[PDB]
mmCIF file of C-alpha atoms in Angstrom:
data_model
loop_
_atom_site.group_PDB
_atom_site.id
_atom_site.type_symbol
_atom_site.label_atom_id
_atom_site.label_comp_id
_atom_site.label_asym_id
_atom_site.label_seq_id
_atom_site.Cartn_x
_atom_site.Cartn_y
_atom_site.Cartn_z
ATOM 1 C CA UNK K 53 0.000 0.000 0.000
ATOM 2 C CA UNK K 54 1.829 3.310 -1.286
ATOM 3 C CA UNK K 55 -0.639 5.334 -3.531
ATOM 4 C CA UNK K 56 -4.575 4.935 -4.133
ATOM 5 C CA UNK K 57 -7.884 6.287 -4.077
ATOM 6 C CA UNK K 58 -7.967 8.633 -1.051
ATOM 7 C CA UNK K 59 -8.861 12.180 -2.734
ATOM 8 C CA UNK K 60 -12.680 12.064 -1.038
ATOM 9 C CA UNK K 61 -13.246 15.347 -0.294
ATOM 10 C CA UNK K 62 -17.314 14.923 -0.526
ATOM 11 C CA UNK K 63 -17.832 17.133 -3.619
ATOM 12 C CA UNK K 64 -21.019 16.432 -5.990
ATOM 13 C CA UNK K 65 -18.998 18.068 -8.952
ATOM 14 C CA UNK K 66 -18.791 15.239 -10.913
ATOM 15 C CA UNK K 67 -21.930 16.273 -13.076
ATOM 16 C CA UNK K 68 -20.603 19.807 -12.869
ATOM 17 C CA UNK K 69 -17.550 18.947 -15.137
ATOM 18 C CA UNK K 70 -19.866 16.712 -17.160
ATOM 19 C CA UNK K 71 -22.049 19.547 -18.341
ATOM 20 C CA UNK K 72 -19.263 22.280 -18.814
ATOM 21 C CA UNK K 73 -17.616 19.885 -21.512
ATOM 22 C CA UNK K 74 -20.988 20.499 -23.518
ATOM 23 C CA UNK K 75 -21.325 24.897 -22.938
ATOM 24 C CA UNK K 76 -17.299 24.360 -24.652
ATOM 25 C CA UNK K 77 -18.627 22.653 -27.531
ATOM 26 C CA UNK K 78 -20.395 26.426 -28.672
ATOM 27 C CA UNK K 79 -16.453 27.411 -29.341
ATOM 28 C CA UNK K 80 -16.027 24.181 -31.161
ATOM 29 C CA UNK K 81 -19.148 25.189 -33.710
ATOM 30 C CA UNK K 82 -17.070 28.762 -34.964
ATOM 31 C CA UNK K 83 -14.308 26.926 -36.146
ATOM 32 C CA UNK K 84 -15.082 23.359 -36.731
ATOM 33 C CA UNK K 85 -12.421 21.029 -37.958
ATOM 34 C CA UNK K 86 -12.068 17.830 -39.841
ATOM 35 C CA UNK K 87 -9.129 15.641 -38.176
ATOM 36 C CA UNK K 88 -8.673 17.253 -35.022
ATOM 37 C CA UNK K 89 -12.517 18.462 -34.898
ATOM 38 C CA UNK K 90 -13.805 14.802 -35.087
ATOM 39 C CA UNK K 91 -11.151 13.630 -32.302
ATOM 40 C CA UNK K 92 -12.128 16.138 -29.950
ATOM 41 C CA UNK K 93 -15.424 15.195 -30.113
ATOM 42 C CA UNK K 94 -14.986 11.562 -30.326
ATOM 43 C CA UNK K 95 -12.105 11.577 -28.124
ATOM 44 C CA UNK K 96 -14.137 13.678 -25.545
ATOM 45 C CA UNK K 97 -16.741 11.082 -24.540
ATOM 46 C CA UNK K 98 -14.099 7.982 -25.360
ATOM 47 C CA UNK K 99 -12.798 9.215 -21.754
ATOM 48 C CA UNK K 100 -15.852 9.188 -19.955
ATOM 49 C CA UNK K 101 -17.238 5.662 -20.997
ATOM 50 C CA UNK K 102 -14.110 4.510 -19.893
ATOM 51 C CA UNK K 103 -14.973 5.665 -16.435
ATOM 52 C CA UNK K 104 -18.746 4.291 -16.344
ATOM 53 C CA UNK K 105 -17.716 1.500 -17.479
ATOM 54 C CA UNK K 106 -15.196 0.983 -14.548
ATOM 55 C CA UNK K 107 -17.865 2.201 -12.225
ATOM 56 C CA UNK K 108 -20.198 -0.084 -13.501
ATOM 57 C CA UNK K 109 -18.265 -3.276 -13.966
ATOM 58 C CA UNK K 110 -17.278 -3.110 -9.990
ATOM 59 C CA UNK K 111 -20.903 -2.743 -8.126
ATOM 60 C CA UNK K 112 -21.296 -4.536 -4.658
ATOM 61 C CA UNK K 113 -25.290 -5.218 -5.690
ATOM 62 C CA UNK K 114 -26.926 -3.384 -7.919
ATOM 63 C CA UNK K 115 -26.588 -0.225 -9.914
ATOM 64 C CA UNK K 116 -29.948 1.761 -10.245
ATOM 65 C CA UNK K 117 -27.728 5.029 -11.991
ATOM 66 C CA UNK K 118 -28.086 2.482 -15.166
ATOM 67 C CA UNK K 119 -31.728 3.502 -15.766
ATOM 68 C CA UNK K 120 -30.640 6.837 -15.996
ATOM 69 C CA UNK K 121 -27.823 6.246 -17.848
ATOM 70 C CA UNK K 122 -29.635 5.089 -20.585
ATOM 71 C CA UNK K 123 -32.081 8.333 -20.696
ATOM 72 C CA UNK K 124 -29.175 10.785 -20.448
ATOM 73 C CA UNK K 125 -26.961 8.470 -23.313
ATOM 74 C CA UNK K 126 -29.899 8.910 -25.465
ATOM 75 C CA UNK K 127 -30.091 12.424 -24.731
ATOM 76 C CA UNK K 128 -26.899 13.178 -26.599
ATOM 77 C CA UNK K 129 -28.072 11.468 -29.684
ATOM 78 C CA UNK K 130 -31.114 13.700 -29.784
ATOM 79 C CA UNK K 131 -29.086 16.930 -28.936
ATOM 80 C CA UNK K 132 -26.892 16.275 -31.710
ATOM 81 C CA UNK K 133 -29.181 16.131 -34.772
ATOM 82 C CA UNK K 134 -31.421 18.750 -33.109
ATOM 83 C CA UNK K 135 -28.460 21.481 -33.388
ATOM 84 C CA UNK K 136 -28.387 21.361 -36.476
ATOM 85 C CA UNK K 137 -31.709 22.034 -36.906
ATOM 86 C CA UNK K 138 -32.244 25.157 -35.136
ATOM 87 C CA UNK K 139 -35.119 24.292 -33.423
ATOM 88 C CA UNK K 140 -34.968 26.836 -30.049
ATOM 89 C CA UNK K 141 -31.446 28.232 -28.702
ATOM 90 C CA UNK K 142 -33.334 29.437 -25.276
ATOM 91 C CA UNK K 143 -34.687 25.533 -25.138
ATOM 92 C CA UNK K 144 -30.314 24.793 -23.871
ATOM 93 C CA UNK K 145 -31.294 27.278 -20.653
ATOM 94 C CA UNK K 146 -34.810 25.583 -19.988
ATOM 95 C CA UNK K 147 -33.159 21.903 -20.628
ATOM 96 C CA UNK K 148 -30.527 22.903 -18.092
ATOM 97 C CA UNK K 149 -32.690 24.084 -15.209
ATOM 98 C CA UNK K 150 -34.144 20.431 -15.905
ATOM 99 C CA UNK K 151 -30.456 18.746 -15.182
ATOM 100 C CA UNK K 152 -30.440 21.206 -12.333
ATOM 101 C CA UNK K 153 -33.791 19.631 -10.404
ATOM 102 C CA UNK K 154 -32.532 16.381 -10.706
ATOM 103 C CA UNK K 155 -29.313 17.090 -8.691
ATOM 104 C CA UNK K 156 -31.137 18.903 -5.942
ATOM 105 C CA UNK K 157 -33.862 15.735 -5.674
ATOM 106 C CA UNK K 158 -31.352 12.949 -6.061
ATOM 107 C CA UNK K 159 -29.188 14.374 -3.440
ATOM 108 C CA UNK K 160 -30.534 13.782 0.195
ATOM 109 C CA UNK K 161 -29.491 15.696 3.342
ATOM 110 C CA UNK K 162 -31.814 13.992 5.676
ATOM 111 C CA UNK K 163 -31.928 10.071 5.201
ATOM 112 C CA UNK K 164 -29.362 8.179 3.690
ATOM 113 C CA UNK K 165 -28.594 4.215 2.754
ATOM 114 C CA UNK K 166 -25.510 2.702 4.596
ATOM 115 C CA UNK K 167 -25.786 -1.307 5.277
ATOM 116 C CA UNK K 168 -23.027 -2.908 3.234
ATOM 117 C CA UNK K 169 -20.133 -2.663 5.872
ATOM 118 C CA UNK K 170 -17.975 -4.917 4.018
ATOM 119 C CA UNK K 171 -17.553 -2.709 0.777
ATOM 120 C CA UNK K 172 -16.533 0.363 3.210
ATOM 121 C CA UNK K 173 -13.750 -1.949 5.145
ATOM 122 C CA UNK K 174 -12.590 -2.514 1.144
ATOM 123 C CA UNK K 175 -12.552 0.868 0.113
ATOM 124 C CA UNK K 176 -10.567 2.504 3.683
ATOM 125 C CA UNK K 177 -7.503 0.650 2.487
ATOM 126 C CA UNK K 178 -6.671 2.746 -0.743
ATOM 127 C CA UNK K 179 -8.033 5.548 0.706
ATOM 128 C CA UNK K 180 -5.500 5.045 3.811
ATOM 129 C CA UNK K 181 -2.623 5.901 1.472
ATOM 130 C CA UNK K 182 -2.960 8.873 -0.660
ATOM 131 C CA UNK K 183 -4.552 10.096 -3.970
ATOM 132 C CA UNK K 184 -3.494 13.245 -6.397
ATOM 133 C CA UNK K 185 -6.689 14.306 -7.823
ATOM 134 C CA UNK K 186 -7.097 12.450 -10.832
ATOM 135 C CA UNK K 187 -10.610 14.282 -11.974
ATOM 136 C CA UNK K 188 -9.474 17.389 -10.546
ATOM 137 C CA UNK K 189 -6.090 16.538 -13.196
ATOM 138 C CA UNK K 190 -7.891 15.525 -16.790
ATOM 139 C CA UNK K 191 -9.795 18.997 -16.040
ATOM 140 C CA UNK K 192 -6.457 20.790 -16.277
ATOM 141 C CA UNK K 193 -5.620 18.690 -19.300
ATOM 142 C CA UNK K 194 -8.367 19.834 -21.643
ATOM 143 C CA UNK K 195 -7.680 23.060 -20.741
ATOM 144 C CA UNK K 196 -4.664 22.961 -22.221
ATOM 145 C CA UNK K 197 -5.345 21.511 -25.427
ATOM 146 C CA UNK K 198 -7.996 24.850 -25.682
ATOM 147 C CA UNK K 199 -5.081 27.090 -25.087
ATOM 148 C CA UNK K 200 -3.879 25.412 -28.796
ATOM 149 C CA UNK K 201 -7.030 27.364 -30.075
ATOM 150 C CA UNK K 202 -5.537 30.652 -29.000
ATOM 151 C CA UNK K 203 -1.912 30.241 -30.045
ATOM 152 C CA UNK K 204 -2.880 29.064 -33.403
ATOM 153 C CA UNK K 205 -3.174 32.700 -34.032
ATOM 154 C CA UNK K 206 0.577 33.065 -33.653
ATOM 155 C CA UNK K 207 1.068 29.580 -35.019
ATOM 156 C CA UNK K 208 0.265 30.779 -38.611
ATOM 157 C CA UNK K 209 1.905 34.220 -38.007
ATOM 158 C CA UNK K 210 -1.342 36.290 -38.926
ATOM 159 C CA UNK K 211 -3.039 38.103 -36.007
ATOM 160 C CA UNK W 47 -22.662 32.593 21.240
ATOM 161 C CA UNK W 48 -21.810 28.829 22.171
ATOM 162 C CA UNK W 49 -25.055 27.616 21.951
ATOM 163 C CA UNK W 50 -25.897 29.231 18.865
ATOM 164 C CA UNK W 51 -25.172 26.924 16.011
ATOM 165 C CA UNK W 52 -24.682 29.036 12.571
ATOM 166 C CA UNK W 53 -23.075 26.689 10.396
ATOM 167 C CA UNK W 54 -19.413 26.602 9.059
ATOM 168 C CA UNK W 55 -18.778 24.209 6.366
ATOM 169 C CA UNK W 56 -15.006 24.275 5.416
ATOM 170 C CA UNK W 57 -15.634 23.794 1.438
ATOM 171 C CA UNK W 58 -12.449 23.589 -0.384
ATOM 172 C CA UNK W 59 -14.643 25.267 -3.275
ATOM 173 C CA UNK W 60 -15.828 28.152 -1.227
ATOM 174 C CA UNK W 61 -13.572 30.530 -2.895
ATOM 175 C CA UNK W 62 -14.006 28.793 -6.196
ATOM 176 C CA UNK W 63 -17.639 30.169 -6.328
ATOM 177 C CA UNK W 64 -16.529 33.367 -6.096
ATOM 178 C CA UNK W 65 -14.308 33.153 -8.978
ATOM 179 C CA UNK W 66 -17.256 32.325 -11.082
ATOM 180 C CA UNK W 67 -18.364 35.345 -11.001
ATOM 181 C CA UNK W 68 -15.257 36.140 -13.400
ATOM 182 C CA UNK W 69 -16.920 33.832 -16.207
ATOM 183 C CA UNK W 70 -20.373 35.364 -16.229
ATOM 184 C CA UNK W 71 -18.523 38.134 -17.078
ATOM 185 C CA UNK W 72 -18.354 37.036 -20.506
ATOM 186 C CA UNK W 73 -22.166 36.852 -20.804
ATOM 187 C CA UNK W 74 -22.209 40.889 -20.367
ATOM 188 C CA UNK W 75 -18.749 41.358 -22.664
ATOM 189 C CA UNK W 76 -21.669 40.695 -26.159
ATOM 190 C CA UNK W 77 -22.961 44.267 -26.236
ATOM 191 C CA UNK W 78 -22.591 45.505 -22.509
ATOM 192 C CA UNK W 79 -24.781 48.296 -21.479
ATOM 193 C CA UNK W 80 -24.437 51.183 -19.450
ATOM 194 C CA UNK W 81 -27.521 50.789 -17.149
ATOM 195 C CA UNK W 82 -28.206 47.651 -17.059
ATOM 196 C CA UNK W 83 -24.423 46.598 -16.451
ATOM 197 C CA UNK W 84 -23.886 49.007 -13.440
ATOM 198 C CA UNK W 85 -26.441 47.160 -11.921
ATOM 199 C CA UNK W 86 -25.493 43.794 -12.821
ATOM 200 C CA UNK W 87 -21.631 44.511 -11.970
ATOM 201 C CA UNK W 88 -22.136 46.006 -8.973
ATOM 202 C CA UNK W 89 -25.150 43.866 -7.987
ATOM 203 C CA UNK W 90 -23.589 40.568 -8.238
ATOM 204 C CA UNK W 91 -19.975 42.229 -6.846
ATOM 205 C CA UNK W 92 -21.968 43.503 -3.293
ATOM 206 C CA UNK W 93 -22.989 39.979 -2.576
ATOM 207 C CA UNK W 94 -19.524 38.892 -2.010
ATOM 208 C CA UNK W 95 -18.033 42.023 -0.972
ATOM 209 C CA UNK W 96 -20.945 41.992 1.868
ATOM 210 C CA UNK W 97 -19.672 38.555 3.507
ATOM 211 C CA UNK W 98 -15.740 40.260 3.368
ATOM 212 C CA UNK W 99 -17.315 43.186 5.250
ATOM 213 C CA UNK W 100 -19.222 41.252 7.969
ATOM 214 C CA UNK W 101 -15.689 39.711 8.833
ATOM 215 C CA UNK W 102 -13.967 43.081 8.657
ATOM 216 C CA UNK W 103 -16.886 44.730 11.141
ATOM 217 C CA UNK W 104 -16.189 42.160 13.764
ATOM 218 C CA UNK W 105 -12.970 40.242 13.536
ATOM 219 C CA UNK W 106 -9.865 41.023 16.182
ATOM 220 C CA UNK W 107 -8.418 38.020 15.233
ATOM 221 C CA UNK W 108 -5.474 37.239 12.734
ATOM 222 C CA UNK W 109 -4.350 39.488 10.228
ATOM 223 C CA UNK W 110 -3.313 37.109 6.914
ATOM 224 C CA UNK W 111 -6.184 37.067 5.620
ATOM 225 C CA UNK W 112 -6.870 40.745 5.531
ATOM 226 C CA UNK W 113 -3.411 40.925 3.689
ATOM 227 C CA UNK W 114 -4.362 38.560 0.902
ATOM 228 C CA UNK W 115 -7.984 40.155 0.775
ATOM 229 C CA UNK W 116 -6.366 43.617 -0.297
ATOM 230 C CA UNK W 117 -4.738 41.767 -2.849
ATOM 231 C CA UNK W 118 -7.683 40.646 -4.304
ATOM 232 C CA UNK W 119 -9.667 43.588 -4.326
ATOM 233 C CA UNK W 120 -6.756 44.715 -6.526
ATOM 234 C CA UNK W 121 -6.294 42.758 -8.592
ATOM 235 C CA UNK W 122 -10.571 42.694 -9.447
ATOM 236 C CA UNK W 123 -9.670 46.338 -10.429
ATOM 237 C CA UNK W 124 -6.642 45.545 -12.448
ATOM 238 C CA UNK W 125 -8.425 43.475 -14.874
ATOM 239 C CA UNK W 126 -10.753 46.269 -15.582
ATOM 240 C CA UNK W 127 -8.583 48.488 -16.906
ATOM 241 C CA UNK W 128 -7.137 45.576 -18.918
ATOM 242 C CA UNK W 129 -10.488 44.615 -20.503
ATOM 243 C CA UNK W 130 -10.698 48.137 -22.242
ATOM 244 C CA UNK W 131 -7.447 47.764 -22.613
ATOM 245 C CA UNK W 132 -7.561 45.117 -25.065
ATOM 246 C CA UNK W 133 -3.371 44.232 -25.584
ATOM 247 C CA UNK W 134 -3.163 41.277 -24.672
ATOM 248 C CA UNK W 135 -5.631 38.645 -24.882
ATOM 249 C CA UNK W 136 -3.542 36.152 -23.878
ATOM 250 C CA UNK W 137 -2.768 37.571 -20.277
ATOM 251 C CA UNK W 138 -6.391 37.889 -18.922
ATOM 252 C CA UNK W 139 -6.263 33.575 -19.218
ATOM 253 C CA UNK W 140 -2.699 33.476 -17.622
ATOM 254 C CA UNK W 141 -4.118 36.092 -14.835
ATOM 255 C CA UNK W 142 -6.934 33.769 -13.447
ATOM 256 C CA UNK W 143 -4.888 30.574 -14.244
ATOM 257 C CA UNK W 144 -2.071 32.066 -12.007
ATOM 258 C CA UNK W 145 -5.391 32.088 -8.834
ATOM 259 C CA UNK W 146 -6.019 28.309 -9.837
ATOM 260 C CA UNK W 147 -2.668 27.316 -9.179
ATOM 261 C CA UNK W 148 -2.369 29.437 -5.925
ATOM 262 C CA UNK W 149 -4.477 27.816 -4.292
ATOM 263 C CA UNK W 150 -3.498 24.621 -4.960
ATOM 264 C CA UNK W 151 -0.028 25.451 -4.104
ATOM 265 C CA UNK W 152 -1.531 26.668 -0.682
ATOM 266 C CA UNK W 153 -3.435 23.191 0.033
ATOM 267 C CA UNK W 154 -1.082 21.262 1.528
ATOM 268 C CA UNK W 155 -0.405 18.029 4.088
ATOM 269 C CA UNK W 156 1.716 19.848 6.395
ATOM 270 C CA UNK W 157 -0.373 22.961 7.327
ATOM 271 C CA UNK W 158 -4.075 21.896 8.235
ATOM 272 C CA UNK W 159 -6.586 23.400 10.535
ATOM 273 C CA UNK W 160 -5.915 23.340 14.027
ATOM 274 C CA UNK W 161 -8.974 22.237 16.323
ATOM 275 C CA UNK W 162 -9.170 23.595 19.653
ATOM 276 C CA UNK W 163 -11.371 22.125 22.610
ATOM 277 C CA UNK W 164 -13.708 24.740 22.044
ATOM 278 C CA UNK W 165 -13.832 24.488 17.874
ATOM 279 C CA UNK W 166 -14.760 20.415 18.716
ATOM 280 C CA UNK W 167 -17.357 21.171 21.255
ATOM 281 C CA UNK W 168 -18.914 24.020 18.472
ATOM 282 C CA UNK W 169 -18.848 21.823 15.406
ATOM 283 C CA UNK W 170 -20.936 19.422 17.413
ATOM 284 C CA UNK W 171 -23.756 21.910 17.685
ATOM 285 C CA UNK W 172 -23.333 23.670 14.515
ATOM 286 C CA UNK W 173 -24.164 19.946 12.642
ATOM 287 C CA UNK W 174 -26.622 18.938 15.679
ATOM 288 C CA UNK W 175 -28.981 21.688 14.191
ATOM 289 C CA UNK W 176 -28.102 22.006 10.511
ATOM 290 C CA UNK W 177 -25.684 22.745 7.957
ATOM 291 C CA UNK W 178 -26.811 26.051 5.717
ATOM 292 C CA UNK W 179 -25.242 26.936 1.951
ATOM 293 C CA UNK W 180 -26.080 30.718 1.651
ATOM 294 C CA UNK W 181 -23.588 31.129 -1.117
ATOM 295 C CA UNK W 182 -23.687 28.257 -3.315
ATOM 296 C CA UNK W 183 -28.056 28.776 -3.217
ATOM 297 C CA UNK W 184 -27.058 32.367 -3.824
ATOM 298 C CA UNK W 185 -24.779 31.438 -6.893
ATOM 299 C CA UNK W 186 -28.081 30.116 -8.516
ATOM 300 C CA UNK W 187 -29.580 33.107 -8.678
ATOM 301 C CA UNK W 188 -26.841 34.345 -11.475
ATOM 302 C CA UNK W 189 -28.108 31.697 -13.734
ATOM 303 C CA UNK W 190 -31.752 32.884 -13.796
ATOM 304 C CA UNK W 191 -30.127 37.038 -14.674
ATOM 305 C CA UNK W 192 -27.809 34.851 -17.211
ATOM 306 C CA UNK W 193 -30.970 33.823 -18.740
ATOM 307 C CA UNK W 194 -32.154 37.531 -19.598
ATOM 308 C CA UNK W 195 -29.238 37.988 -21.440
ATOM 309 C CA UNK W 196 -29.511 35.339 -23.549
ATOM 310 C CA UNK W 197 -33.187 37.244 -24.698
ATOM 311 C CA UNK W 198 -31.643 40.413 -25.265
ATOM 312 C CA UNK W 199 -30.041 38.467 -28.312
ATOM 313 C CA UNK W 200 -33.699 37.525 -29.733
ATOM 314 C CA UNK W 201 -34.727 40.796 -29.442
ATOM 315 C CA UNK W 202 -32.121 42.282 -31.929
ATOM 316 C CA UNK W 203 -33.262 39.673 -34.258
ATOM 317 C CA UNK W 204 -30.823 36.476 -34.260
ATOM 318 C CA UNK W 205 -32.853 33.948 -33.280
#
């Protein structure tokens, strides 16, 4: 035991960095490109199916966040032919507030589900020897690859 | 009082929801007016400046904090000057990256917060009763005036 999972610091902004990585994609539709446009996109969400499906693969029971899942994955399919069309730009705000209900109801402050005492004595052993952030770090590494957007300006030698 | 629990949640993103203020800011930058932007600059500015000013009233304790406080209310004004500026782009994203890594630079192992007998004895009352979020329910309230911005943009006749 040296280094693993021990960065829980209690914070629901898991969700939070979810949703920012679609408000970026509005900078992605002024100057779309063909290689590096399609693995940006495609290379965005490759990372976080990787995750659920490491998340998923190790339950202790059952996993009930798979119904939702589903309604959310779907979500993205829908999203992405309806730019296109131009349907409603306000509809992004309204959808939000939407996102934003389901956070406040699914998290609960006053009663909460704690049996399986087995899977906590697992889990206390990597978090008894230390973590660096590693969600906190792949948020610091797509912000770098924006900062490529900005010094492509000096990159060509124009502006 | 002792027996007068008011809450006080250590959040290692307290000062984080401050500096999103900074990226609303954007929002306003499309077409800022006069009127309206006085009061949204100064309105959403007052609400954090208020909680540095209740601490100021009644403090007689410490004086670090005060010192890096100064230097934040300068450097708030600095940027000003910069954004009519308009030299260098690149700076304003170096300024606010330079405050991300600052304060992870200050978290660290070594230096932690030091409980007294009486801080113990507090905490138990101050969760006994309940645990309040004034400013994160208070950060909501910029996405509903973000919202009215995004119908000024209909109105001119873009969507």
């Amino acid at each position: 035991m040296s280094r693993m999972p021990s960065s829980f610091d209690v914070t629901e902004r898991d969700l939070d960095d979810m949703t920012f990585g679609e408000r970026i994609i509005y900078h992605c539709k002024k100057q779309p490109l063909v290689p590096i446009g399609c693995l940006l996109t495609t290379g965005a969400v490759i990372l976080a199916a990787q995750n659920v499906r490491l998340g998923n693969k190790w339950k202790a029971q059952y996993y009930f966040r798979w119904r939702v899942g589903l309604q959310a994955a779907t979500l993205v399919a829908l999203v992405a032919g309806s730019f296109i069309y131009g349907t409603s730009g306000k509809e992004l705000k309204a959808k939000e507030e939407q996102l934003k209900e389901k956070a406040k109801m699914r998290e609960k402050l006053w009663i909460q589900e704690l049996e399986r005492r087995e899977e906590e004595t697992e889990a206390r052993r990597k978090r008894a020897e230390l973590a660096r952030m590693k969600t906190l770090e792949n948020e610091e590494e797509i912000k770098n690859l924006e900062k490529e957007l900005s010094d492509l300006e000096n990159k060509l030698g124009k502006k």
